[PDB]
Design a protein around this ligand. Structure first.
Ligand SMILES: COC(=O)Nc1ccc(-c2nc(CNC(=O)CCc3cc(Cl)ccc3N3C=NNN3)[nH]c2Cl)cc1
Ligand SMILES: COC(=O)Nc1ccc(-c2nc(CNC(=O)CCc3cc(Cl)ccc3N3C=NNN3)[nH]c2Cl)cc1
Ligand SMILES: COC(=O)Nc1ccc(-c2nc(CNC(=O)CCc3cc(Cl)ccc3N3C=NNN3)[nH]c2Cl)cc1
Lengths: 236, 236, 236
């Protein structure tokens, strides 16, 4: 996260860190708890992942230093990628992880609500991006989960900033005209969380951008409300 | 209907009683007129129904005692069940009956309007459940069509009351925290009718609940607005 | 267009005239620029069109007399018709033309924005129908692009006027109770353009009606917001 600050332990209790054990164990990408056997994340995270067996999901984590050989985790029973995904920039960047066991909900780990089809015209004013990603384009994975408040921008606006891409209605964009705050490498698959009517909604999945936090380059996120049918179908 | 009252003749002119003639003729479930050859009802009503030939649809009925051997009815040309239905509790509990002849609309029999996709955020405050079902869990089919006003509850609220089920965005729930008014056995397939802007909309199809009218157990209804594409496709 | 007036050059810069070169060149129908290789139009326009090779798309046109042998045009690489279209009156009257080259946007030719799924409850009050069609049922193609302001009517209202048709939620209707202003022969495939919040949206595609501009016979238009998924899918 560029231009963010350290989170308070458990203020983002749906946020997970997904690790790979190959070749030695490391953070791979963010994700969100949406059901007690279910993590919502980005399809692109699974490039060159041949098996769910090398994946570990850690919940209730603030600092990456909490994770050691003796730390408990959830195994992944199945990776489910949207059947129309090709790459982050052309959309459908969405995947589900079916956990081998179920998450016991608690103050340190609990699900985030999905937005509802009838909220397509809601104006979110309290949206945050979170993760353990780089603090600039050339950096390293951060120990402490970072947060940053970022305003939504309309698709018409986002499209003007990405003339060489098609910004579709299945994407949503967030950023400062002058940049300075954004996701970056290591944040993808994580949530864009917006509080509305005292409740937090999973509005976006962190997906792609041109560099990190650059002026006139909003972050691009998978527009979660567009996939609620798909989520329902697959989580059966 | 638990805790309801007798309806006035024709105040629910889209409400039908669907009968089976096997082994002797009896009420099977409720339904709603949505087009002049078309009844909207619940898929689960057709468990063990091998043929449309044993089905009779009665319209303009207030009292089950109006129905006798010489009473006219509409035969069913075809039963159409949603192809993803398995059982009431996992959703898609929706079916269409194509009538052999067309209904002549009149004050005693006429169609109810379907809700529109752009009403997903409407707040219905005037909703009623109707049918000839039991007045409690252990009872019998009632002679006179009963009605009851029941408030909608949000899906988040409904979900808390049904911890062992998945209450999906394709369901909608209605009930009193303290219970006392609800559908019951014999009511299913019938409408949940809500009046908005001087017009009645078919918001729900009566589907399932844990017992009838129990405290903290709202009734669960198929969320009709979610199926308008499906209704359009099939009624061609 | 019945009861309309001459347009100002370039006030409808997304409007195109689609011509056929067989047997001698003539106007065939209207269309709208929605992307720089993409025209949105009506499926029915392509009845008996065996090949894209005989199609020419002209942009930046006010008067049909601008079109001559030496006038530049865009060839069509591909005709894409909705796979569920059978005929205008049963709906799905929508088609895309993939142009052989890309349109250079300018003040005389530029794309119109598609409505968004979250605008299904917007109340459009500033809607216009445009084209080079007949000024009455028995007439000829007009030289100068005509315009007419026409109010939207609800589907319930439209349905009452077309008792022998099914007016679906994928259609939208516009007209005066007393008639007098409407599309007519030669206008189809063209836009119904509504200005909302200082922006123009492509709300309808001119599709069908009973005669032209008759009292109690609104024009019927393909309801574009219902096809945004389809447009996205096909324009890949
Ligand atoms: C010790 O373990 C490790 O080192 N782990 C580790 C794990 C993963 C990665 C990694 N993940 C990605 C995928 N992209 C993202 O995460 C953010 C995409 C993104 C989204 C928005 Cl909204 C805005 C901007 C950007 N954006 C553009 N440029 N950069 N970011 N790339 C790399 Cl590299 C690196 C190191
Ligand atoms: C002489 O002819 C006859 O005797 N006819 C006859 C025909 C049908 C049936 C019959 N129909 C059903 C299916 N369920 C429903 O109708 C209501 C479901 C329901 C929905 C909501 Cl929202 C809330 C609660 C409930 N709920 C839970 N418990 N009970 N009800 N079960 C039986 Cl049994 C019985 C007798
Ligand atoms: C020199 O080149 C030429 O002569 N070119 C040329 C090209 C095309 C046509 C032509 N196109 C059509 C298809 N229908 C429409 O265009 C409008 C449909 C429509 C829509 C609404 Cl909303 C309301 C009313 C109507 N409506 C009903 N009755 N009439 N119109 N029919 C014919 Cl004929 C004629 C001549």
């Amino acid at each position: 996260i560029v231009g963010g600050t350290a989170s308070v332990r458990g203020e983002w209790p749906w946020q997970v860190t997904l690790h790979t054990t190959s070749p030695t164990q490391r953070h791979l990408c963010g994700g969100s708890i949406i059901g007690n056997q279910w993590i919502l994340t980005a399809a692109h995270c699974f490039y060159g992942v041949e098996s769910p067996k090398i994946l570990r999901v850690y919940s209730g984590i603030l600092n990456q230093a909490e994770i050691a050989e003796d730390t408990s985790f959830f195994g992944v029973q199945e990776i489910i990628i949207h059947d129309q995904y090709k790459m982050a920039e052309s959309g459908y960047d969405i995947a589900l992880l079916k956990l081998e066991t179920t998450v016991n909900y608690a103050d340190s780990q609990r699900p985030i609500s999905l937005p509802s089809k009838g909220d397509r015209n809601v104006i979110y004013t309290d949206c945050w991006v979170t993760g353990w990603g780089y603090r600039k384009l050339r950096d390293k994975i951060q120990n402490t989960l970072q947060k940053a408040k970022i305003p939504l921008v309309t698709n018409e606006e986002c499209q003007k900033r990405y003339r060489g891409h098609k910004i579709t209605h299945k994407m949503i964009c967030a950023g400062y005209r002058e940049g300075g705050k954004d996701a970056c490498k290591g944040d993808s698959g994580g949530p864009l969380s917006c509080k509305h009517n005292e409740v937090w909604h999973l509005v976006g999945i962190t997906s792609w951008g041109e560099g990190c936090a650059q002026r006139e380059r909003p972050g691009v996120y998978t527009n979660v409300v567009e996939y609620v049918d798909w989520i329902l179908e697959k989580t059966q």
